[PDB]
Amino acid sequence: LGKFSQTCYNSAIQGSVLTSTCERTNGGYNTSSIDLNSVIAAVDGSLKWPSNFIEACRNTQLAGSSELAAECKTAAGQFVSTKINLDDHIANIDGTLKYE
Amino acid sequence: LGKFSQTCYNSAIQGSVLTSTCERTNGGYNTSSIDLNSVIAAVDGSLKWPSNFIEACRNTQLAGSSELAAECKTAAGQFVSTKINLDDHIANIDGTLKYE
Numbered sequence: 001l002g003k004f005s006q007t008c009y010n011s012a013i014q015g016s017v018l019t020s021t022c023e024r025t026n027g028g029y030n031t032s033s034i035d036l037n038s039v040i041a042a043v044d045g046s047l048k049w050p051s052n053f054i055e056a057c058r059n060t061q062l063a064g065s066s067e068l069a070a071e072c073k074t075a076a077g078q079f080v081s082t083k084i085n086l087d088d089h090i091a092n093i094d095g096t097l098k099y100e
Numbered sequence: 101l102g103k104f105s106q107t108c109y110n111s112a113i114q115g116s117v118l119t120s121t122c123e124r125t126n127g128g129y130n131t132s133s134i135d136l137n138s139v140i141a142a143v144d145g146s147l148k149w150p151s152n153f154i155e156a157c158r159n160t161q162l163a164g165s166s167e168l169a170a171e172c173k174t175a176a177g178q179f180v181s182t183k184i185n186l187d188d189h190i191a192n193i194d195g196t197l198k199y200e
């Protein structure tokens with residue numbers, strides 16, 4: 001996976017955004033950016049790649065009126081029960097669900 | 101923050117997606133969805149809210165050709181040095197930077 005740096009140049013980071021100028025298949029280049037804020041996490045002082053839950057969890061369900069429940073895989077490899085209250089961060093903003 | 105469930109109904113979870121029918125300011129309702137995959141993480145079997153790095157880190161820089169370096173806050177409250185190789189997951193796809 002990855003390996004952008006091998007065929008890109010003029011790379012820069014500002015805040016959470018990576019910008020680089022990269023080779024196209026046909027020759028020539030294109031400059032683009034990617035905002036990494038939501039794809040890199042800071043965990044106890046260490047930068048980590050994301051741990052999106054669907055890649056580690058099964059049997060997602062709504063529990064009650066606001067809880068997301070699932071069975072998720074531990075580092076040891078077993079699935080354990082877990083839940084999280086969606087009311088912590090999901091808001092009704094004038095009729096539309098939004099994260100805050 | 102959050103609290104959608106207080107003024108929404110007919111909520112459902114399928115996979116990583118929450119769907120609900122929520123009250124608008126003017127009365128009446130709107131049905132919407134939100135894909136939580138990238139806003140909820142699975143960490144060692146436990147669902148957690150995101151830890152986007154910019155909310156915990158300072159002095160982001162490009163180190164060399166492909167590393168993101170920063171100083172990030174530990175649970176204890178001190179900033180420590182950390183880095184992550186963007187080549188792990190950022191690809192040049194025909195001239196455009198993409199996460200994979």
Ligand code: NA
Binds near residue numbers: 001002191200
């Ligand atoms: Na690829």
Ligand code: NA
Binds near residue numbers: 058059060
């Ligand atoms: Na499943």
Ligand code: NA
Binds near residue numbers: 101
């Ligand atoms: Na709000």
Ligand code: NA
Binds near residue numbers: 157158159160
């Ligand atoms: Na800063």
